[PDB]
Every structure is written in structure tokens, then in C-alpha cells.
């Protein structure tokens, strides 16, 4: 009824909308890297260059 | 972490020439640099700091050049009074460093 914007629908076949199975869960895959990048030695350096 | 070498080991040139010393770094140290001279039986004295600026009371014959990795110390004219050992100091990062100063370079002037 909402698609036709009418309270009465004549006999027939109407295409209303679409369907799509929603995702079940979420996964994320990254390489087995554990070393943390040397942000400390670059940022926390006592003296910087010119 | 920071290691340097100083070359040449020794130089010899008559009174009218120009003597030059190379101080090279494993990784770049920017301008941060200092050149030191010690007479025998005498503590070292600062000659060039920041690799470019002349020290106090030092004659205008010693020139420091280069930036980053390669640094050169050039003397326009010798007078047989600069015959001594020269060192270059990293003065950049000394967290875990065996020696802030580099190798020894003795200057020999034959007059």
C-alpha cells in the first residue's frame, strides 16, 4: 500500500522492495607485526636538526 | 648508537699550504658539531662549534664546512703553531655512545 500510495490495491503482482541478508559478524586481518614503530625516538629526541 | 671516524691520521705540509681534516658520521648529525684542539701538555680548546661558528679568540684561519654526514675542517694558512691533535664531537645524541669524540689527527708542520 505504501509503495502505491493508496489504501486499496487492485488484484495483481507488485514489486515492492529488495532484500539483502545482513552481515553476521566482523573480522579484521593484519600481518603478525608486534614491534611498535619508533615514534618515541624521533619525537622524544632531546635535540632536533636544523 | 652514534659512531664516527676522523681522517686523516696525520698530515704534513709546508708553511704556505692548507691543511684539511674530514669528520664523517655513520648517520646524519645535522649542524650539531664541534672541533677541538689540544696542545701537548695542555687541555683541548674549542675552535669551531656548530661546525661553522668561530670560537672566541681564535684567528680567522680555521674553516669548518659540510653538514649532515660529512664535515671538513680546513685551515687556510699554517704558521707551525697549529701542530696538534684535532677532534670532532657529535654533540647530538649521547644516550648510549662509546665516545662522543672521534679519532685523533696530529698535524705536523715542517718549517
Curated annotation (Swiss-Prot), chain A:
Residues with glycosylation annotation: 24, 26, 32, 44
Source species, domain of life: Viruses
Residue segments, region Disordered: 20-36
Subunit structure as annotated in this protein's UniProt entry: Binds to host ACE2. RBD also interacts with the N-linked glycan on 'Asn-90' of ACE2. Cleavage of S generates a polybasic C-terminal sequence on S1 that binds to host Neuropilin-1 (NRP1) and Neuropilin-2 (NRP2) receptors. Interacts with host integrin alpha-5/beta-1 (ITGA5:ITGB1) and with ACE2 in complex with integrin alpha-5/beta-1 (ITGA5:ITGB1). May interact via cytoplasmic c-terminus with M protein. May interact (via N-terminus) with host bilirubin and biliverdin, thereby preventing antibody binding to the SARS-CoV-2 spike NTD via an allosteric mechanism.
Protein task: Attaches the virion to the cell membrane by interacting with host receptor, initiating the infection. The major receptor is host ACE2. When S2/S2' has been cleaved, binding to the receptor triggers direct fusion at the cell membrane. When S2/S2' has not been cleaved, binding to the receptor results in internalization of the virus by endocytosis using host TFRC and GRM2 and leading to fusion of the virion membrane with the host endosomal membrane. Alternatively, may use NRP1/NRP2 and integrin as entry receptors.
Name under which the protein is recorded: Spike protein S1
Species name: Severe acute respiratory syndrome coronavirus 2
High-level lineage: Viruses, Riboviria, Orthornavirae, Pisuviricota, Pisoniviricetes
Record gene name: S
